[PDB]
Structures are given as structure tokens and as C-alpha cells.
Design an enzyme around this catalytic site. Structure first.
Site, PDB file in Angstrom:
ATOM      1  N   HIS A  68      -8.689  54.764  84.649  1.00 34.09           N
ATOM      2  CA  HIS A  68      -9.906  53.935  84.464  1.00 34.09           C
ATOM      3  C   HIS A  68     -11.121  54.676  85.081  1.00 34.09           C
ATOM      4  O   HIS A  68     -11.763  54.131  85.962  1.00 34.09           O
ATOM      5  CB  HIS A  68      -9.717  52.485  84.985  1.00 34.09           C
ATOM      6  N   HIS A  72     -12.519  58.036  80.643  1.00 31.41           N
ATOM      7  CA  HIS A  72     -12.236  56.836  79.793  1.00 31.41           C
ATOM      8  C   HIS A  72     -13.538  56.227  79.294  1.00 31.41           C
ATOM      9  O   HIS A  72     -13.606  55.899  78.097  1.00 31.41           O
ATOM     10  CB  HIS A  72     -11.461  55.817  80.594  1.00 31.41           C
ATOM     11  N   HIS A 106     -18.218  49.851  80.838  1.00 36.14           N
ATOM     12  CA  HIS A 106     -17.318  48.676  80.685  1.00 36.14           C
ATOM     13  C   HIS A 106     -16.300  48.609  81.809  1.00 36.14           C
ATOM     14  O   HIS A 106     -15.699  47.545  81.953  1.00 36.14           O
ATOM     15  CB  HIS A 106     -16.714  48.549  79.293  1.00 36.14           C
ATOM     16  N   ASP A 107     -15.992  49.712  82.492  1.00 33.58           N
ATOM     17  CA  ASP A 107     -14.986  49.701  83.601  1.00 33.58           C
ATOM     18  C   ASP A 107     -15.637  50.184  84.905  1.00 33.58           C
ATOM     19  O   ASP A 107     -14.909  50.687  85.789  1.00 33.58           O
ATOM     20  CB  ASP A 107     -13.750  50.536  83.257  1.00 33.58           C
ATOM     21  N   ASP A 217     -11.636  50.181  73.346  1.00 35.99           N
ATOM     22  CA  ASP A 217     -10.960  50.279  74.668  1.00 35.99           C
ATOM     23  C   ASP A 217      -9.574  50.851  74.521  1.00 35.99           C
ATOM     24  O   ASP A 217      -9.051  51.608  75.476  1.00 35.99           O
ATOM     25  CB  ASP A 217     -10.960  48.916  75.298  1.00 35.99           C
ATOM     26  N   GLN A 269       6.128  50.738  74.691  1.00 37.62           N
ATOM     27  CA  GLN A 269       5.090  51.186  73.728  1.00 37.62           C
ATOM     28  C   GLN A 269       5.276  50.507  72.349  1.00 37.62           C
ATOM     29  O   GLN A 269       4.282  50.041  71.767  1.00 37.62           O
ATOM     30  CB  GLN A 269       5.096  52.709  73.758  1.00 37.62           C
TER      31      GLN A 269
HETATM   32  C1  LIG Z   1      -3.835  47.149  78.870  1.00 40.06           C
HETATM   33  N1  LIG Z   1      -2.967  48.006  78.137  1.00 40.06           N
HETATM   34  C2  LIG Z   1      -3.393  49.216  77.595  1.00 40.06           C
HETATM   35  C3  LIG Z   1      -2.175  49.825  77.240  1.00 40.06           C
HETATM   36  C4  LIG Z   1      -2.056  51.093  76.638  1.00 40.06           C
HETATM   37  C5  LIG Z   1      -3.130  51.774  76.108  1.00 40.06           C
HETATM   38  C6  LIG Z   1      -2.841  53.039  75.557  1.00 40.06           C
HETATM   39  N2  LIG Z   1      -1.663  53.712  75.490  1.00 40.06           N
HETATM   40  C7  LIG Z   1      -0.634  52.988  76.010  1.00 40.06           C
HETATM   41  C8  LIG Z   1      -0.798  51.693  76.607  1.00 40.06           C
HETATM   42  C9  LIG Z   1      -1.110  48.913  77.551  1.00 40.06           C
HETATM   43  C10 LIG Z   1       0.341  49.110  77.358  1.00 40.06           C
HETATM   44  O1  LIG Z   1       0.794  50.178  76.952  1.00 40.06           O
HETATM   45  N3  LIG Z   1       1.142  48.089  77.786  1.00 40.06           N
HETATM   46  C11 LIG Z   1       2.445  47.765  77.213  1.00 40.06           C
HETATM   47  C12 LIG Z   1       2.888  46.280  77.571  1.00 40.06           C
HETATM   48  C13 LIG Z   1       4.404  46.336  77.930  1.00 40.06           C
HETATM   49  N4  LIG Z   1       4.616  47.794  78.256  1.00 40.06           N
HETATM   50  C14 LIG Z   1       5.762  48.225  78.789  1.00 40.06           C
HETATM   51  C15 LIG Z   1       6.792  47.246  78.922  1.00 40.06           C
HETATM   52  C16 LIG Z   1       7.950  47.771  79.549  1.00 40.06           C
HETATM   53  C17 LIG Z   1       8.035  49.072  79.918  1.00 40.06           C
HETATM   54 CL1  LIG Z   1       9.362  49.775  80.712  1.00 40.06          CL
HETATM   55  C18 LIG Z   1       6.930  49.994  79.681  1.00 40.06           C
HETATM   56  N5  LIG Z   1       5.806  49.566  79.105  1.00 40.06           N
HETATM   57  C19 LIG Z   1       3.605  48.696  77.674  1.00 40.06           C
HETATM   58  N6  LIG Z   1      -1.603  47.797  78.084  1.00 40.06           N
HETATM   59 MG   LIG Z   2     -11.377  47.186  81.763  1.00 40.93          MG
HETATM   60 ZN   LIG Z   3     -11.478  50.265  79.518  1.00 37.90          ZN
END
Ligand SMILES: Cn1cc(-c2ccncc2)c(C(=O)N[C@@H]2CCN(c3ccc(Cl)cn3)C2)n1
Ligand SMILES: [Mg+2]
Ligand SMILES: [Zn+2]
Length: 313
Positions: A68, A72, A106-107, A217, A269
Site C-alpha cells: 500500500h 500502488h 486513495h491510500d 484499485d 486467488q
Molecule cells: C483486498 N484484496 C485485494 C486482493 C488482491 C489484489 C490483487 N492480487 C491479489 C489479491 C485480495 C485477495 O487476493 N484476497 C483473497 C480473499 C481470500 N484469499 C485467500 C484465502 C485463503 C488463502 Cl490461503 C489465500 N488467499 C485471497 N483482497
Molecule cells: Mg485502500
Molecule cells: Zn488501494
């Protein structure tokens, strides 16, 4: 007036594409931002001296966190640049001005922790702002910098125009709270499907701008796969740090924030792609058809994470 910003040929051509990566040279990023403002907004939009000073005070107010961070901010502003450039006639002079600045701010002053963690920690900001905690702080830091001597980039607007652009910025920054995204996209989905989406309706414009903010974002998921994969490392470096701070409060984190569970990342993912990313770009493409290259790239990355899971990588 006559003092144009000019990029090297490769950046001149690739900065127009949605999947552009701003590069590792931090000193070039101010310049890339001003270039984008000048083409998206005009060379008369902002006083260059005011804009440069503003940008540098913004950079200084991002922290040295894995994800962040200043990079970004500039990356989110580029994705908005690409949207605005592919949708010339849809947006007002005020909106183009406001939305690049909202994306850069924004952050502001992010510590690398979620709203959730601030609330469980009992951080002072969770008392001042009960919802969208960090996003209300980002807007409050943006007004701070606009109010330093020499940093009022909007000084040539009237009282009422100045109030409108700060309201565009406030709503656009609040909209980056992902908790608000799901209901916003559903409202947009019905309005589009029932043909009642009306861009002259201000309440409607605000929702579309909200979804553009989410799209910009999350734009990590819209890059080429080598960029997308390496960006995931920085994201999960902050998730696992928060996981570690949860475990210090005596709270088992969700698997997303638990480093012991790095094995479940590729399935984590897919859910994200299926539940947030693809729906976000799908709806964006229905409302703004020329943003389709974002949905195409996101789908390409989903296929890559399904190959990881199959051990094809
Ligand atoms: C806020 N936000 C932005 C991103 C983002 C952005 C760009 N690339 C990748 C993730 C995510 C995101 O990946 N979050 C999910 C939500 C659940 N999650 C899990 C769940 C279990 C395990 Cl073991 C590993 N990851 C990934 N959440
Ligand atoms: Mg933010
Ligand atoms: Zn952001």
C-alpha cells in the site's frame, strides 16, 4: 504553458495500454503522473509548480509498506488514466481533474493493516471513523495536503466547483473500501439489466465512478502474468504481517492472513477472481464497453492460477 512532458518511445506507446507497468525507477513516476494529467485533463488544468509540490507532498505521506505504497498509488492512477482515455466524451472536466487526484491520494498514510485489524486493535482511527475507517483517514489526509501553503491545485475553481471536486474525491476514495463494492456492483447489475442505468442521474454517476475506483484499485489482476504473480508476493507480505499482529492480539487469523497456510494461496486467488475480480470487470465492461481489455487480462490471470493448481506451474 508551452512546457510539455515527453516519455521515451516505449513508455509513450505502452502507457496507453491497460496492462502498462510503471517500472522500478521511482524518480520517473512523478513525471508519468504529470504526463497523464496533461493528456487526460489538459496543460491548463493545474499550475505545474502547485501540481509538482502537491505530488511530492503526496509521495512523502505514503509509508514504506510492501504493497500500500507510492507505487500502488501511481499504478491505480494509471489504470484510471487508461479508462478516462478510452472514454473521452463520457466525463466532465471536473471529474477528469478529480479522479486522477483521488487515485493518487486513495491510500494516503496506509499502515498496511485492514479496517478489521484497526477495530480489533482498538486504534484511535476506529473511534473517529466507525465504518470505512482507513478510507475516511485517506480523504482526511488528502484535504490536509490540499491546505498546505502552495498546494492548492484547485485555486482557479469557484467556491461551488471546488466543493463539487472535493465531493467527487471524497466519494471516489470512500468507494475503495472493498466492503462497499459488493452492494454497489449488484445495484449497477440490476440498473443495467433493467435498462434503468442513466448517466445523467448523479446517484448513478457516483455508482459507476465507485466501480471504476474498485477496478483501478484491483488492477494488479489485469496485468501480464509475470507482473500479476510478483505483485501477489507484496500483497500477501502485508496480509501475513497483519496475521502476525492478529496472533499477538490472541486471535487466529483467516487463512488469507496466516503465513502457516501459504499452500492454500492458489485456491484463495480463484475465489477472489470468481467473487470479486471477474464480476467487477464484467459489470464495468457492460457499462463502459471500451474497458474490455481489463476483463480479458483478468480472465487470462484466472487461467494462470488454475494452471498453478494443476502444477502446470
Ligand atoms: C483486498 N484484496 C485485494 C486482493 C488482491 C489484489 C490483487 N492480487 C491479489 C489479491 C485480495 C485477495 O487476493 N484476497 C483473497 C480473499 C481470500 N484469499 C485467500 C484465502 C485463503 C488463502 Cl490461503 C489465500 N488467499 C485471497 N483482497
Ligand atoms: Mg485502500
Ligand atoms: Zn488501494
Amino acid at each position: 504553458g508551452l512546457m510539455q512532458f515527453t516519455l521515451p518511445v516505449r513508455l509513450c506507446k505502452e502507457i496507453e495500454l491497460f496492462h502498462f507497468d510503471i517500472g522500478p525507477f521511482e524518480n520517473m513516476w512523478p513525471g508519468i503522473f504529470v504526463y497523464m494529467v496533461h493528456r487526460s485533463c489538459g496543460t491548463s488544468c493545474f499550475e505545474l509548480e502547485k501540481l509538482c509540490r502537491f505530488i511530492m507532498s503526496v509521495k512523502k505521506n505514503y509509508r514504506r509498506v510492501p504493497y500500500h505504497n507510492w507505487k500502488h498509488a501511481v499504478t491505480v492512477a494509471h489504470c484510471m488514466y487508461a479508462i478516462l482515455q478510452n472514454n473521452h466524451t463520457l466525463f466532465t472536466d471536473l471529474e477528469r481533474k478529480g479522479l486522477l487526484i483521488a487515485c493518487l491520494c486513495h491510500d494516503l498514510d496506509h499502515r498496511g493493516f485492514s479496517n478489521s485489524y484497526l477495530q480489533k486493535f482498538d486504534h484511535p482511527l476506529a473511534a473517529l471513523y466507525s465504518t470505512s475507517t482507513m478510507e475516511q483517514h485517506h480523504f482526511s489526509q488528502t484535504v490536509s495536503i490540499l491546505q498546505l501553503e502552495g498546494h492548492n491545485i484547485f485555486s482557479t475553481l469557484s467556491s461551488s466547483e471546488y466543493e463539487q471536486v472535493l465531493e467527487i474525491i471524497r466519494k471516489a476514495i470512500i468507494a475503495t473500501d472493498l466492503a462497499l463494492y459488493f452492494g454497489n456492483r449488484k445495484q449497477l447489475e440490476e440498473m443495467y439489466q433493467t435498462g434503468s442505468l442513466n448517466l445523467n442521474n448523479q446517484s448513478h454517476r457516483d455508482r459507476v465512478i465507485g466501480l471504476m475506483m474498485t477496478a483501478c484499485d484491483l488492477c494488479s489482476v489485469t496485468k501480464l502474468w509475470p507482473v500479476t504473480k510478483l505483485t501477489a508476493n507484496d500483497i500477501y507480505a502485508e496480509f501475513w504481517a497483519e496475521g502476525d499482529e492478529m496472533k499477538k492480539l490472541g486471535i487466529q487469523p483467516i487463512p488469507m492472513m496466516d503465513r502457516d497456510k501459504k499452500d492454500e494461496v492458489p485456491q484463495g486467488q480463484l475465489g477472489f477472481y470468481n467473487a470479486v475480480a471477474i464480476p467487477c470487470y464484467t459489470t464495468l465492461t457492460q457499462i463502459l464497453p471500451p474497458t474490455e481489455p481489463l476483463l480479458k487480462a483478468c480472465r487470462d490471470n484466472l487461467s494462470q492460477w488454475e494452471k498453478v493448481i494443476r502444477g502446470e506451474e
